[PDB]
Amino acid sequence: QVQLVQSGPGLVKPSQTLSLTCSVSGDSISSGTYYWSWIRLPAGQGLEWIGRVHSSGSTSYNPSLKSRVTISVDTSKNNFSLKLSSVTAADTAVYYCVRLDNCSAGYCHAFDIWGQGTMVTVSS
Amino acid sequence: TQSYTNSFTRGVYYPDKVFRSSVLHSTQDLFLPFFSNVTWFHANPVLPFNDGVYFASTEKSNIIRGWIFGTTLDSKTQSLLIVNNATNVVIKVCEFQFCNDPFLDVYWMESEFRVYSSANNCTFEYVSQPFFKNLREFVFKNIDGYFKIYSKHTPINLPQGFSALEPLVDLPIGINITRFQTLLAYYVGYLQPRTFLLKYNENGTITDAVDCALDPLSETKCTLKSFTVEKGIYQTSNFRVQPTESIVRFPNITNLCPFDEVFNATRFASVYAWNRKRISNCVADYSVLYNFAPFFAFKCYGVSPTKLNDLCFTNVYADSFVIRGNEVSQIAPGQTGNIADYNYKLPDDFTGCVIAWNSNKLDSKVGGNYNYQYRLFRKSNLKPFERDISTEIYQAGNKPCNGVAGFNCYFPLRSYGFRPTYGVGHQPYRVVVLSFELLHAPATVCGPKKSTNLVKNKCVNFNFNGLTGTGVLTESNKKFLPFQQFGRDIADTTDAVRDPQTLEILDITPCSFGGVSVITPGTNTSNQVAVLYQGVNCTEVPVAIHADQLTPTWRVYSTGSNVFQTRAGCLIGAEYVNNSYECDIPIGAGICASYQTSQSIIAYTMSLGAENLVAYSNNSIAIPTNFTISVTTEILPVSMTKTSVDCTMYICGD
Amino acid sequence: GTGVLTESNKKFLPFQQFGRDIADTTDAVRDPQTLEILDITPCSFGGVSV
Amino acid sequence: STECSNLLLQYGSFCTQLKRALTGIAVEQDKNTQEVFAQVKQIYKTPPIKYFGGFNFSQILPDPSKPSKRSFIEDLLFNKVTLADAGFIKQYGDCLGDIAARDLICAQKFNGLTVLPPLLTDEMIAQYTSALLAGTITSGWTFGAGAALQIPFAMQMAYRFNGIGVTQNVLYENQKLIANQFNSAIGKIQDSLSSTASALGKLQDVVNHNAQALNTLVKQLSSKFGAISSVLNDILSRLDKVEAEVQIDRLITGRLQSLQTYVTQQLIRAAEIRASANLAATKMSECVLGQSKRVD
Amino acid sequence: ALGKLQDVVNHNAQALNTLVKQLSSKFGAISSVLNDILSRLDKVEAEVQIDRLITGRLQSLQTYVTQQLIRAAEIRASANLAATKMSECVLGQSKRVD
Amino acid sequence: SVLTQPASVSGSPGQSITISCTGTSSDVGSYNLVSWYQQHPGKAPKVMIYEVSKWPSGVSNRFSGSKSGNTASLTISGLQAEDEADYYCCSYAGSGTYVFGTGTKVTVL
Ligand SMILES: *[C@@H]1O[C@H](CO)[C@@H](O)[C@H](O)[C@H]1NC(C)=O
Ligand SMILES: *[C@@H]1O[C@H](CO)[C@@H](O)[C@H](O)[C@H]1NC(C)=O
Ligand SMILES: *[C@@H]1O[C@H](CO)[C@@H](O)[C@H](O)[C@H]1NC(C)=O
Ligand SMILES: *[C@@H]1O[C@H](CO)[C@@H](O)[C@H](O)[C@H]1NC(C)=O
Ligand SMILES: *[C@@H]1O[C@H](CO)[C@@H](O)[C@H](O)[C@H]1NC(C)=O
Ligand SMILES: *[C@@H]1O[C@H](CO)[C@@H](O)[C@H](O)[C@H]1NC(C)=O
Ligand SMILES: *[C@@H]1O[C@H](CO)[C@@H](O)[C@H](O)[C@H]1NC(C)=O
């Protein structure tokens, strides 16, 4: 049973930085089998992929959001963290941490196990 | 009572029968690794055999009196039994029904019962002479259908000396042995494939050995082919990360190729009008072709028949026709003759297979089979895979024919006269030519190979549509165009590939590797060493708990030992100090190492000398008031040895 | 081979049938009938200058 | 490929001889540098007051600001020569992804060809040159023969004028003119090094020859040498054991020949470099540590 | 003390020993012993194996001679330096520093 | 970029509905790597289809996937009130990146 739990702050003013963190239980991120990605769902709009990290530290970011984004991983604590800066009314969304299977464990390029989601609100 | 202890340097035996004296000889064989963990049984389940067994016993009472080897240890399978009688030794390979706890009872007659209930269907017999404290050592190997036994007896005060085991007996018994048991405190160890450096003294005795894979110092000794090492840094073998898995990625193709209708055709085409069939979008099992026609063997060019099931092709072509036997040699690249010039031409760069078989019973008639024809006359040679089915009158002479045959106006086609009484060179032969198209466009014909999962970010063996290799697969940002299936680099090695099922582009990177250097003071000073992993970051230094995922088998604990990161690589086992000394052992990029006082190996930034502020000023001069007469030595080579080579004697002897 | 055969003082063990040298050439052999050890030496040779 | 390795074992000690020759060359390079630059028994330093009879040594004396402590002219020279591979650390990421394809160094490394760093760093060599310069301008030629004996720089120049057969009153009566001429000549050297783009041709030639030899070695891996393919994996996946062994033997013989050619050319070029280094060490002894009478 | 002269001697001895040890290489032949090839094979196949051995041993000789030529050039440069030092340091007093 | 998906689709019980998802020629028309996700309200998205037309273990066969040209399609046969969610399409866009659809609101009458 693989579980993903988010604990980041959900109240961030504009021109600040997010500090979202997602811990994983039931699996070792240090195994390198999966990628670990952050996906945002704004209200009204559809899902948006922000980026992904791998145990070795390699990352792949959404080209539009690449400038102001950083995704890191701690294998010691079995978690990965998202930092989105230049926060603006566009950034208020439900943020999920999700396990991505890159064909290494069966399913090819499928986001299978999703986190509960944290509502990040942007206001002064 | 199973305990565990250390084998030290025991268990070395003579690898062969060749006499050698005052030499160092390197041998790769099944040896008991130095300082291995052996099991001490003070005693009964049956122990495994593995690749080979080292057996030791310090007993004096002669209670241990033989061994049992086999797989099932029952009458279902043959089993080897060795019994050391008080006067002789008897070895048998009968099918014994061994007891669960066999042992030899004495009551003086020594009963062979209580070991086995029965000995049926015997197949071998052998009798010979029977085999402080007296340590007795044996090595049992089962290779090449041969059971080899080496042995030795040593007086002791497992000692830490050296004692080689002479070949005691060799038995030509081809039996399976995976388990063994002793017959009534003994030590049992297991052999591994190892390279040893053995020292033969003047009398021919092996008096010392070096286990190359034991540790960095032993690897240095094996590389230098010496038992002593001078102070310095030595480039030993390179570390390589070994692949964990093997992956196969083939296109999803379900249909079976219709080769049976190619081979099992009622009538074949004439060679001038040879039949061509296209094979595509199917799974091709080439091992079943042997069942369709009674041909003796394939004749393949650029490929081997037994490999055809591991490959994928864009398209396959099957060309079928009939010729006579003495023309079968013409169906080959770079050939000349009537068939090759005017009927069927293979390309010079042909990759494929030719299958020809005698068809006298089907293509011959008592009156002569005239249905099969060949072109005899043509103005020019055919191009490869070009078909000419014209029937125009051939104009050999300058006089025109006007479409009517005659003298110098021959009809271009002539008929074979296949008859059952002809010799084999004139009998009909049915020919099928398989032409393979490799690489380029996506494959549509593949062998019966099951596709695994596509594993990324790990060092794996990979097989993409027959393109094999080893490396790490990652997502690629190379902008492959839709028609492009793989990418190459300067060395003409594939570095990118399109996955046949997902159609994504994958980068292929070599698995982690690099050079290894061993830093040592003289072995006359210490056995401690440091290890430099050249041009690698200390974070990427190979740490491999498993012995099959890295080539250097010895392990120096990276985190455990001192770790320093120089621009020449990661140094493990030397402590970095902030003092500066004159360079002793050069590491590189200003870093040197030395064995210094507890004494250990220390790394340091080398010193260029002491600073000297010169008391310069506008009007100050230093003048010497005395002098020293100095005498110094300079040594210069002038000549070297003059050598002569008898070229013929060196190359050819006499 | 070709050479001069002499009595050998090499201490062949009973299981050993021949001896080799650095160049992997047989330099000693056990006679199959008498079981004695014989040294094999190359026949006399040398360079000539005029 | 283990099949290829087992076949290559049958060719004896050719690989070990090649490795030994390359190791000899590598050690000789550090020996060359040490013989040229480590000609000083102490790291001499000038006093903080930098007046030497009006001669301006500022562009050749060390610049304490920069991390390398190089002089201005040494900075110009260092920027004038572009090295192909320094021998320092290369991590995963520089040879992964789309960056390997645009770099020949990654292909060289992936095919077993690496560069070792020099024992002496550039900073250490600059320290040696600054010690030599401080010794020369503070003590003349005395530090080459024993302890550095300080002497005023104008008086040292008077000594040197005597060395070429000119009376020293000529130096003393023309001291300002001689200092100005030297300052202008140094400025011309600096301007020429700043402006002209190909002054250091010989060093660039050494670098280019090494890079070309390595690139030729890498490109030789795409030759078939009479085999069906230049790729061992294709041969092993397309052919059975015996015919694959034949093709692999052809590839092994060709690649062994290419390695031997590379090592032989390296040995010859190393001998030429060693002769140049011996000349440089002689010039350091006889032109820097003393005044020479040898014409030209 | 006399490291350079010992190095010259050692390099010569090592080159000769490597040349001798190269005679045990098979170079792709069935055997490194010509006598075994000639006693085990007929004329044509023995000729093939012998050609392999000949090519390998010829290459080893060529490598030895090339390395000898390069080392001889180095030795000649050292000897020329020694002769210059005999002329200028023993037969006269030198002004050349060092 | 985004994959054009209809804002909402509707259907009656027992009938199949086809939801489309159109991308460019470099994401949907370049790979067999189309995924489908279902979002019930107050929950996290759940993968229902991967690799265009493959079913994750424990997914009903009534959700079929297909691809034609630069468009992907999800077919729901035997529609019921259980299939009342928001349906998103995802495609691998190359270079390790992904593009998601706008989302379709399925309503059951
Ligand atoms: C012994 O039997 C096992 C199967 O139980 C087989 O895998 C193995 O190859 C056999 N070994 C010999 C030497 O016959
Ligand atoms: C060889 O045997 C003799 C006795 O025959 C003995 O004196 C000598 O020490 C032995 N050689 C060695 C190396 O021990
Ligand atoms: C080793 O890796 C770490 C983390 O990737 C990096 O910060 C460091 O610079 C590397 N070592 C060197 C010598 O660059
Ligand atoms: C050398 O100095 C550094 C501080 O720059 C310190 O971290 C290190 O521990 C010192 N090493 C020793 C051996 O004292
Ligand atoms: C040396 O002479 C120069 C030039 O006159 C002068 O500037 C400097 O101060 C003098 N140094 C001392 C220590 O008097
Ligand atoms: C010069 O040195 C020698 C030996 O070092 C010493 O005996 C002698 O007294 C010295 N002369 C003077 C004048 O200092
Ligand atoms: C020495 O030369 C530099 C550069 O040409 C110049 O800036 C500096 O002023 C000069 N020093 C003196 C004392 O003129």
Numbering used by the authors:
A (entry chain H): 1 to 124
B (entry chain A): 22 to 64, 78 to 141, 149 to 172, 183 to 208, 213 to 239, 261 to 673, 686 to 742
C (entry chain C): 545 to 594
D (entry chain B): 743 to 1038
E (entry chain A): 941 to 1038
F (entry chain L): 2 to 110
Which passages does the manuscript contain on this structure?
SD1-1, SD1-3, and SD1-4 are from two BA.4/5 infected vaccine breakthrough samples, while SD1-2 is from an XBB.1.5 vaccine breakthrough sample. To determine the binding modes and details of the interaction of these potent neutralizing mAbs with S, we determined high-resolution cryo-EM structures of complexes of BA.4/5 spike with SD1-1 Fab and BA.2.12.1 spike with SD1-2 and SD1-3 Fabs. SD1-2, an IGHV4-61 antibody, binds in a similar position and orientation to SD1-1, but shares only 72% heavy chain Vh sequence identity. In addition, the CDR-H1 and H3 of SD1-2 are two residues and one residue longer, respectively, than those of SD1-1. SD1-2 makes a footprint of 660 Å2 on SD1, slightly smaller than SD1-1. Upon binding of SD1-2, K535 forms salt-bridges to both E554 and E583, both of which, in turn, salt-bridge to H109 of CDR-H3. The disulfide linking the 6th and 11th positions of CDR-H3 makes hydrophobic contacts with residue L533 of CD1. CDR-L2 is not involved in interactions, and other CDRs make SD1 contacts similar to the corresponding mAb SD1-1 CDRs. Mutations T323I, K529N, T547I, T547K, N556K, L560Q, A570D, A570V, T572I, T573I, and E583D had no effect on neutralization, however, mutation E554K led to complete knock out of activity of mAbs SD1-1, −2, and −3.
